[PDB]
């Protein structure tokens, strides 16, 4: 049973957030469903849950603006948090539980979703600009060469980078984004590959910025 939340990654201050979790391989009915969020570099805060039949239960601190809905006919359940502020910036996850379908039996949050980052800001969304980090003799050492992509000026977070459509995975390092003085993020993705394969093998980075719904594919050559 897999869970997949979806929704905007950007919300203007004082506005309302709306996220929906879609279940696959399992059914909403019979189970409890929770929403959870994690502030950057901080702990997990349970938001609340909903029983397929309609019964809900929210945490005290949030309750006054939380609203969990279920849509048993689509196998989804949604969340709505009113009047968002920067304090509400976090990665929102959906998970089954924690009350078991079987009355006896233990309480646990499982399975979990992938999570979705929600940034509250008045700023506009901006797609990234991708430049190559070409393999030079200055990026070579023995049988290994370094190359990558430079993802500049995008907002808000996050950006995902993969190489050769997921085919290349080892020796890949995508750094944490850093906020430039311009108020825009930036990051680089590097991968170390065999120096001999630089003449033969083709290397392309796959940049994805869900927020601006932008996708770039850059060829990195010598």
């Amino acid at each position: 049973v897999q869970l997949q939340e979806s929704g905007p990654g950007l919300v203007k201050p004082s506005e309302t957030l709306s996220l929906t979790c879609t279940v696959s391989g399992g059914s909403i009915s019979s189970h409890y469903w929770s929403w959870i969020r994690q502030s950057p570099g901080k702990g997990l805060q349970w938001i609340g849950y909903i029983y397929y039949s309609g019964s809900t239960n929210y945490s005290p601190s949030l309750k006054s603006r939380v609203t969990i809905s279920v849509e048993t006919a689509k196998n989804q359940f949604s969340l709505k948090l009113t009047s968002m502020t920067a304090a509400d910036t976090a990665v929102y996850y959906c998970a089954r539980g924690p009350v078991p379908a079987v009355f006896y039996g233990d309480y646990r949050l499982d399975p979990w979703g992938q999570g979705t980052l929600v940034t509250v800001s008045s700023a506009s969304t901006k797609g990234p600009s991708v430049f190559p980090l070409a393999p030079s003799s200055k990026s070579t050492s023995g049988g290994t060469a370094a190359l990558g992509c430079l993802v500049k000026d995008y907002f808000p977070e996050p950006v995902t980078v993969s190489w050769n459509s997921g085919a290349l995975t080892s020796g890949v390092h995508t750094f944490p984004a850093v906020l430039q003085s311009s108020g825009l993020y930036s990051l680089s993705s590097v991968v170390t590959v065999p120096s001999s394969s630089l003449g033969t093998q083709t290397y392309i980075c796959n940049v994805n910025h869900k927020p601006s719904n932008t996708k770039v594919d850059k060829k990195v050559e010598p």
Binding site: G43, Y93, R108, L109, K138, S139, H173, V178, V190
Partner: protein
């Protein structure tokens, strides 16, 4: 209500060593409400232990929970590089679910020297009117390192930014990026761009450079 308190805040172990995580509750807790979670860098939490000592399907044997009442414990018999993560204990009570602060598991290992590479800015970026010189310090240990930018052999300030990855799942090393940012013009008025890396594992401070005419 009830509060969970984890300890230590951070735990540093080498592969093989045993890990003992502690979770204490400001009140007695029925074992059926206590669960353990593992969360690896930029990835969703996952269940490890439920009912205080029951291991979740597919979880390695080295993981095991014990304890009761107010002192619960998570034990990793023999830590492995991939176990690098944050661990949380959660409880349910009074119609409310809550988590501990979590315990960060850091992996100790032998000193590894960083491999340094440097990347002149692309021509496409220069046509945009900005230059980004990227210096990379790949796979090293420990995390402490120093990188200075020297333009035409002159030390720079406030025009570069660093980013560091979290410990690698396999080799437990770090990687660092230092980006020097200049206007096309300022970049134009100079030629030798150098990256000087000072890491514990390097006998002598390493430098990687290039002349703006390659």
């Amino acid at each position: 209500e009830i509060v969970l308190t984890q300890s230590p805040g951070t735990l540093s172990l080498s592969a093989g060593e045993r890990a003992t995580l502690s979770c204490r509750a400001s009140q007695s807790v029925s074992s059926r409400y206590l669960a353990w979670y593992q969360q690896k860098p930029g990835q969703a939490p996952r269940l490890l232990i439920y009912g205080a000592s029951s291991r979740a399907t597919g979880i390695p044997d080295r993981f095991s929970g014990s304890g009761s009442g107010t002192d619960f414990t998570l034990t990793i018999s023999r830590v492995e590089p991939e176990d690098f993560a944050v661990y949380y204990c959660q409880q349910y009570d009074n119609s409310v679910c809550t988590f501990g602060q979590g315990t960060k598991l850091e992996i100790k290992r032998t000193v590894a020297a960083p491999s340094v590479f440097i990347f002149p800015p692309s021509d496409e970026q220069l046509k945009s009117g900005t230059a980004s010189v990227v210096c990379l310090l790949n796979n090293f240990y420990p995390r402490e390192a120093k990188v200075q930018w020297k333009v035409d052999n002159a030390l720079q300030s406030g025009n570069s930014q660093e980013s560091v990855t979290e410990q690698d799942s396999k080799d437990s090393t770090y990687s660092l990026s230092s980006t020097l940012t200049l206007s096309k013009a300022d970049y134009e008025k100079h030629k030798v761009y150098a990256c000087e890396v000072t890491h514990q594992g390097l006998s002598s401070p390493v430098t990687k450079s290039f002349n703006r005419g390659e």
